[PDB]
Specification:
Layout lengths: L4 E3 L2 E2 L2 E7 L4 E6 L5 H15 L22 H12 L6 E2 H7 L6 H9 L12 E2 L12 H10 L8
Parallel strand pairs: 5-6
Antiparallel strand pairs: 1-3, 2-3, 3-4
The structure holds ligand OGQ and zinc ion.
Length: 158
């Protein structure tokens, strides 16, 4: 029950609506086909597409989607995925479940990821099925393959 502003921006994947309150960025939507949090979001995202050399030098906006408010399994998944899976790497679902404190919760990791409010920022596209299988993507498989090809990964396809 937040009150939020909305920014927009051009991307190699279409136009990207950013939504967020004062306490933090809520969502990042893709359509395609001001305040500090969203100011840092728009900056980071262009750092990602156009100057990825030093993506790690742009700061990560605070996040205030409800999923991050109280503790959950979904929150530990998303928070750990953001902290450890860097640009250029990937992680299997099964191994992300282990990283989030339950090596047998792969199905729950799959579901935790489907409700990610801020793609790329939280790198849900770096979570693959296996060494040779990139898996699905809730943004569309070609997006995932694009993003991984953008990061130079062997499972990318542009
Ligand atoms: C990590 C991550 C999460 C979310 C996105 C962006 N995707 C969406 O926001 C999103 C919104 C709504 C739908 C929807 O169907 O209403 C989807 C979506 C699917 C979401 C989850 C899913 N599984 C968990 C199996 C499957 C989805 O399939 C979709 C299919 C279509 N079409 C066939 C048109 C459209 C939307 C789908 C996604 C990005 C990254
Ligand atoms: Zn909020």
């Amino acid at each position: 029950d937040c009150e939020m502003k909305r920014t927009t921006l051009d991307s190699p994947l279409g136009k990207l609506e950013l939504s967020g309150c004062e306490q933090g960025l809520h969502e990042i939507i893709f359509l395609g086909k001001g305040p500090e949090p969203l100011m840092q979001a728009t900056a980071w995202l262009n750092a990602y597409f156009h100057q990825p050399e030093a993506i790690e030098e742009f700061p990560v906006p605070a996040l205030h989607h409800p999923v991050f408010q109280q503790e959950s399994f979904t929150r530990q998944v998303l928070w750990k995925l953001l902290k450890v899976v860097k640009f250029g790497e990937v992680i299997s679902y099964s191994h992300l479940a282990a990283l989030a404190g339950n090596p047998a919760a792969t199905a729950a990791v799959k579901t935790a990821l489907s409700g990610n409010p801020v793609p790329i920022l939280i790198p849900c596209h770096r979570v693959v099925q296996g060494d040779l299988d990139v898996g699905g993507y809730e943004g569309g498989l070609a997006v995932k393959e694009w993003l991984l090809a953008h990061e130079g990964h062997r499972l990318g396809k542009r």
